[model samples]
Target: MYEVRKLEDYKSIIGEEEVSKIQEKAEKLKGRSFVHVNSTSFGGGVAEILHSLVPLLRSIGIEARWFVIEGPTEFFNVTKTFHNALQGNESLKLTEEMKELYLNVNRENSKFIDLSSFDYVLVHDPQPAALIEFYEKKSPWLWRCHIDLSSPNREFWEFLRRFVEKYDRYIFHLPEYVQPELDRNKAVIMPPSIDPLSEKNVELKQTEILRILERFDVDPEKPIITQVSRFDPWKGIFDVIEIYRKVKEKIPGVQLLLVGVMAHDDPEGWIYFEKTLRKIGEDYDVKVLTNLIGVHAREVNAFQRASDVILQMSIREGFGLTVTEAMWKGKPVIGRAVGGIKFQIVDGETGFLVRDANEAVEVVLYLLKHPEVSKEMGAKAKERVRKNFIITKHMERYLDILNS
Candidate 1:
């Protein structure tokens, strides 16, 4: 799933003359082994990051690999609910069936994956968190959570806590996500990042960007506004549509593109996708897509690069990787000022932040009218990503934990 890449490929965007010092740091773990576990391999951000990161670790001589946990739809349905509740959903009711199916599937899947052979085993998210309980090893076991767990459904969290508290380290994208009961010394604030060399963030020619847009029946000349994320409710695709409809009332020709990929673990994706489509019905400039096969990373690269402005207006988010991606393409992002999105954008600086649809449309319209100011802010957005949020920075931090 990963192509061979050198650290120097990152040199141009990151402005590093050589990646020697960082590679030198990683070289310490030349023969060190680690395996990263997550629920899906194709659609979501967790799988995407580990896919790129593991290969880079191997390039520097570390023996890194990725493993995915398998389960039936029942396990996935429950986990999807857990995902919502942890992102601060107030009305979710936890049930015994949810716990039973989640534990049963993980216990069954753990029998096959060899967790004991690695120097470290890193588990991502709540889907397969209980895997640590079945295997015994002296190596450090770490739990990496990529959710806004500021106010989670404690009943479900406590169910997961039995497995979570056993980890040697806890890595969260923001310090604010750390639970009150978690030991401060045991936690690390390591935000997620985009790989500039990866397919999604890689640079494309103007012709390449235009060609991709043309195939989707989008006019190259029209002002395109876009949001690229999974079709999850929290991603605020519904709110994005509401803002688009209002924005269109004023500026009739502006287009709204909602591009999403359905991850296997997210059972609610198709349901929400249909809900989004019905809401977008007969809207002249609205484009809604749930692409699985033909829409690769480069396709997403075009969506962000082609747009006049990008929105990651997630009601709740976990670092908003797509926010960093749009910013990486030097586009101004308008994201809800929640979760780790605050870590990526500077309000009124690199991008605009909004709390609701009204605020979102005000900034969205401002950027569309003041093209020169939008361009200036876009340049600042790119530099902000360069200064902090890139994959090398993510890998270096991982190597730190591995060496720790």
Candidate 2:
């Protein structure tokens, strides 16, 4: 149903032994099946992971399908509020009716999600968390939370937990993310992964890289610091700019590119994009691109390969997939020391994790000044992604969960 690439094809990077080991595990789940349900068909990491990982699941002699729960505009807007509040943003005062609206939409969607057809089901994020509460689960179920709940809004967290607790298992990106406390034994911390072979991350030639840079009016001679994410407030776009400004104090040629792509369900995406564009208006040193979404594999691959550094400076994160993606490309990434970014960055090893905008600028400058250090850090970053965050290993863990 998706691109069919062999696991052995990854051996040149991950090595022959690891690929074979993953293949052996795949054999055990040869006939097993799973279905992953999330909120959108495009944009964001959740959909990106599903689009890439589902094929690997099928490739490894297993049956797998990807699904998105259908919902209306109001339903999605309310869910967006839930998302922000869950990240500890107090501005979004979630109401009882809003919670009911979120529940009712899932109630309607549960009627046709077909949980009984698969041997196992994985429901992602908070949008469809309520679906299991309303539907009669016919197989093993896991509520896979891709959000950070390290300190969620008490009311919204409790309300969401009420539904989350109903699942057979809870999957989080980190041990700290299972913040609200539930069945810990059933709680498994499996970080979401990136496909190195995918269009957005695959190896790129110099010609392709220059073509993208020219297409986007980026001067390759200058140092480029880029970020690939939705234009949300939480991603620290403002803070990134502050860091860039700090870097510009001595390095005028250094540039900042907020490479953004909006998802279907996030209502505030365009609004945030406009606000970000307005703030960064007419600055030759700064660029924000939104028209670069569907062809992101080619576009994002070029951006990362051509750039000197990648920024995943989120105020809070659920294992920054962009950080994972940038690290896979062997680029030095400067990320905030919060949420999953903490685990992804080994500080002075794979990449640098900063506490704020000031630390971000210092790390960015240090990486740029020392080319040899940058090269070593990039190599380690790529090797770490190979060892920890590839689809083969991700599938192996899923098999572990399914078999148990």
Candidate 3:
């Protein structure tokens, strides 16, 4: 495991004044254990954030640990349905068998994982939300919802509300993503962040970039448009394919890359990955890569650096890290005008935000046709990410929130 630097090491990045403030905050929480409980240990943004953030938190003198729950494929399927339902997909129906399987898995997991050992326990997303009901002892439990719930299905929201109301506090990625009817006093907003020093965000050499590009069989001369996200329907991977096809009508030499890593919690990812492969079978111009789990961050940075443009067309996002990652790499992004994507793109300034396939096609073509405008936007995008979305700012906000 890679150990993160201590708070003192961050003096160069955050300056002495801010570092002293962080140290002051750390003194308050000294010897306290902050435990994060979620469904998976790898794959997905939640796992990725926890991987870097937990180590950094420990280095700051907070005793931080991560816990992963065990669940079968059937349990994961039901949780995936609940996830989509919470995002306003009402057509999904959960039978008694599915409900039993989900809760039963939680019951089994509770026996192995102790919830009373920590000062604070953060339960991430819906998969482990129900575990709170089975806890035998009391602790400062928080439910962190990392999905859009602006207009969730009423029935599904009601089901989750039963478990959520028990939490001492609820955290969301954005205010708009929170349920409108919920009590404002009980909720907090903390946007997700990207680690600038991670393998995915670090500066790389031209030789390294070319080597990875060649390994992936991607053409260096072509105008590359890439989307690095999980292979889920809500991510709008299919929509990206449609838009890429439309854009190709005007620009014949353009190439599209849809890269993703599978998560243990998302049982639907493999199914969706197969569906995507079938849709773009053996196409010379379109490439679909999957199971690139561990080495993805470095390759992700390389792809962003090598690409002409990056795309994040999620219909619903929980603080889309790809937007910030691409922007940090000095690439202009074309993203869907929904969810957390709105917070990143400045529309005609940093990048373009589109609503549908036709709009995405128009935006992509416009940027490609005007190289100077695109370059200026990309430069501004990098500066914006540097000023606001990097890990240092994110850590400062977290420490402030903890003190509050």
Candidate 4:
């Protein structure tokens, strides 16, 4: 299901110098068999990134393969709990039964894939982290974590760190995310990026943008503020609604759209989605849609394009690709200054980094009042994304790591 993306195709956009650097780096890593193991085949940013990343690597002569581990709903529930706990959910407990299930599922999954032959094994997140413990490993294993691990639960981190310690390298989104116990030299800080060529981040004409919005019953003329993410607690969708309400009170006809994507591995998403609907109440102007209900990447692209302002109200983000996406589309974003959102947004240059719902509402009101300033910031936002957060730069970083 992966598309072969050409490195030369990006030359016009990323410039000759950057493309040359990527090609040279890939040349050194050519023919290296790299396998990536993750939980789901679709849904989150990891899947979206692999869809582009795996193919791009193959195009440059690297032997890259992407594998998704299959498990029961119960396994997913346990892993989802682990996911939250790893992102600083202090109240959650990792029980013995949960540990057994997590291990058994990984043990069963390890029997299917022969990892001994691959030159490199990159396990993503905690779902398949134990594969190294179960499978016969011959080459270097890299544990790539895409979660906010700055302040993980002590119990969960200590448990997971055993598996993590066995790996040759640890990859995190930022240096702060690297645990204190890990070897500083072994930790590689690589932030995530967005595929500008993907359906979700590609350029959409004004007509197509308006048609997609009208199809969703969202008025194109009304000023719309959007937050595109999952229904997770860390996503802060409720905060987005609260800020939207405050903005609507002052702007009169302002609308809010909470767009989310359904991931098969996350059962908690459904529960949180239901709670978000209750919080939204009987407000017609505030529309909440997802991929399950006919909102695909193209639809998401339209939503981001149609939005006058975008918000990523995540309390803990793993690089906030949605924020990168909005900035790529030349839209001014006002995201909470937490996790990787702080790095994606340049505070006042590219987008506004807020502290809370009150700060977000103030920035939203200011952006609405000054259209010229919004346009200028939006232009800078696009440039920042182009230079730093595009998929080509992401590919180069991975190739550099592999080469090293």
lDDT per residue for candidate 1 within 182-292, as digits (tens), equals 788888889888888778888899999889887787776877899998887899888888888889889888899899876665669888887877877887578775565
**lDDT by candidate, in order shown:** 0.82, 0.81, 0.81, 0.87
TM-score of each: 0.81, 0.83, 0.79, 0.85
Scored by Cα lDDT, where does model 3 land?
Answer: 0.81
lDDT of 2: 0.81
Cα lDDT of model 2 by residue, 1-404, tens digit: 11116666677877878877777777867887788888888874777767667877777788888877888899988888888889888767878888788888887877765665688888888998887776577788888887778788888888888888878898888877777578778788899888777777788889988888888888999989988887888999888888888899989999888887766656688888878878877887787766534436688778878889888888856677888888888888898887778888899998898787888888898999998999999999989988889877787788878878
Mark the 10 consecutive residues where model 1 has the least summed lDDT: 1-10
Highest TM-score scorer: 4
Clashing pairs in 4: none
List candidate 4 segments past 4 Å from native: 1-4, 71-78, 85-114, 134-138, 151-155, 232-246, 262-283, 291-293, 356-359
The per-prediction tally of clashing pairs is 0, 2, 0, 0
